[PDB]
Motif scaffolding. Structure first.
Motif, PDB file in Angstrom:
ATOM      1  N   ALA A  42       0.709  -1.308   0.014  1.00 44.89           N
ATOM      2  CA  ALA A  42      -0.101  -0.020   0.006  1.00 44.89           C
ATOM      3  C   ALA A  42       0.805   1.348   0.115  1.00 44.89           C
ATOM      4  O   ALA A  42       0.442   2.129  -0.397  1.00 44.89           O
ATOM      5  CB  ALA A  42      -0.802  -0.121   1.447  1.00 44.89           C
ATOM      6  N   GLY A  43       2.065   1.105   0.522  1.00 40.15           N
ATOM      7  CA  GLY A  43       2.993   2.396   0.425  1.00 40.15           C
ATOM      8  C   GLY A  43       3.444   2.754  -1.091  1.00 40.15           C
ATOM      9  O   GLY A  43       3.071   4.008  -1.540  1.00 40.15           O
ATOM     10  N   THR A  46       0.110   4.020  -2.828  1.00 40.04           N
ATOM     11  CA  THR A  46      -0.295   5.167  -2.092  1.00 40.04           C
ATOM     12  C   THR A  46       0.556   6.135  -2.757  1.00 40.04           C
ATOM     13  O   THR A  46       0.239   7.457  -3.061  1.00 40.04           O
ATOM     14  CB  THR A  46       0.121   5.180  -0.601  1.00 40.04           C
ATOM     15  OG1 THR A  46      -0.811   4.257  -0.179  1.00 40.04           O
ATOM     16  CG2 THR A  46      -0.191   6.635   0.076  1.00 40.04           C
ATOM     17  N   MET A  49      -0.697   6.750  -6.563  1.00 50.11           N
ATOM     18  CA  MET A  49      -1.728   7.512  -6.496  1.00 50.11           C
ATOM     19  C   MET A  49      -1.493   9.043  -6.155  1.00 50.11           C
ATOM     20  O   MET A  49      -1.962   9.963  -6.761  1.00 50.11           O
ATOM     21  CB  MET A  49      -2.890   6.768  -6.035  1.00 50.11           C
ATOM     22  CG  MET A  49      -2.586   6.972  -4.485  1.00 50.11           C
ATOM     23  SD  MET A  49      -3.001   8.245  -3.302  1.00 50.11           S
ATOM     24  CE  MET A  49      -4.612   8.522  -3.440  1.00 50.11           C
TER      25      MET A  49
ATOM     26  N   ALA B  15      -2.307   5.569   4.430  1.00 51.83           N
ATOM     27  CA  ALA B  15      -2.816   5.076   3.176  1.00 51.83           C
ATOM     28  C   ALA B  15      -4.263   5.518   2.924  1.00 51.83           C
ATOM     29  O   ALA B  15      -4.703   6.030   1.892  1.00 51.83           O
ATOM     30  CB  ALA B  15      -2.739   3.705   2.978  1.00 51.83           C
ATOM     31  N   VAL B  18      -4.447   9.705   2.616  1.00 46.60           N
ATOM     32  CA  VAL B  18      -4.084  10.335   1.347  1.00 46.60           C
ATOM     33  C   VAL B  18      -5.241   9.757   0.109  1.00 46.60           C
ATOM     34  O   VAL B  18      -5.407  10.333  -0.592  1.00 46.60           O
ATOM     35  CB  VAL B  18      -2.503   9.791   0.905  1.00 46.60           C
ATOM     36  CG1 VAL B  18      -2.161  10.350  -0.456  1.00 46.60           C
ATOM     37  CG2 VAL B  18      -1.582  10.189   2.016  1.00 46.60           C
ATOM     38  N   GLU B  19      -5.708   8.530   0.560  1.00 41.77           N
ATOM     39  CA  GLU B  19      -6.753   8.015  -0.299  1.00 41.77           C
ATOM     40  C   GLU B  19      -7.941   9.209  -0.184  1.00 41.77           C
ATOM     41  O   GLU B  19      -8.225   9.618  -1.194  1.00 41.77           O
ATOM     42  CB  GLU B  19      -7.284   6.598   0.415  1.00 41.77           C
ATOM     43  CG  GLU B  19      -8.371   6.040  -0.175  1.00 41.77           C
ATOM     44  CD  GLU B  19      -8.537   4.625   0.562  1.00 41.77           C
ATOM     45  OE1 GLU B  19      -7.970   4.392   1.474  1.00 41.77           O
ATOM     46  OE2 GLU B  19      -9.630   3.971   0.227  1.00 41.77           O
ATOM     47  N   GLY B  22      -7.347  12.085  -1.702  1.00 46.13           N
ATOM     48  CA  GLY B  22      -7.278  12.224  -3.301  1.00 46.13           C
ATOM     49  C   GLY B  22      -8.188  12.360  -3.952  1.00 46.13           C
ATOM     50  O   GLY B  22      -7.974  12.964  -5.254  1.00 46.13           O
TER      51      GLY B  22
END
Lengths: 49, 51
Positions: A42-43, A46, A49, B15, B18-19, B22
């Motif tokens: 996920a890093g 992340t 994105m 996660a 920032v999700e 986003g």
């Protein structure tokens, strides 16, 4: 003399903890192999994105 | 492993931090150029409104 004695004897096993309790530490080392990678998974995504 | 748990939990925070941030960019996604779609398409008229 005319003596022949050829002999054998038996072993004493040192108390190597002598219980399964070793597992719990081994379970912690499982989890540190296990639960760590997805952080990076996920890093990196992340970071995508 | 608790250090792992802590950083992994701060990272299942991160996660998701920032999700959730986003998509606000997707909220801008309209207001960034459709906003331009108002601005330039208008001042192409304001400069033609003198005429």
């Amino acid at each position: 003399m005319a003596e022949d004695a050829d002999m054998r004897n038996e072993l004493e096993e040192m108390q190597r903890r002598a219980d399964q309790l070793a597992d719990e530490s081994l379970e912690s080392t499982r989890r540190m192999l296990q639960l760590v990678e997805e952080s990076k998974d996920a890093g990196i995504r992340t970071l995508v994105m | 492993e608790n250090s792992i748990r802590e950083l992994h939990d701060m990272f299942m925070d991160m996660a998701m931090l920032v999700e959730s941030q986003g998509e606000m960019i997707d909220r801008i996604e309209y207001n960034v150029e459709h906003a331009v779609d108002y601005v330039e398409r208008a001042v192409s008229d304001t400069k033609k409104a003198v005429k």
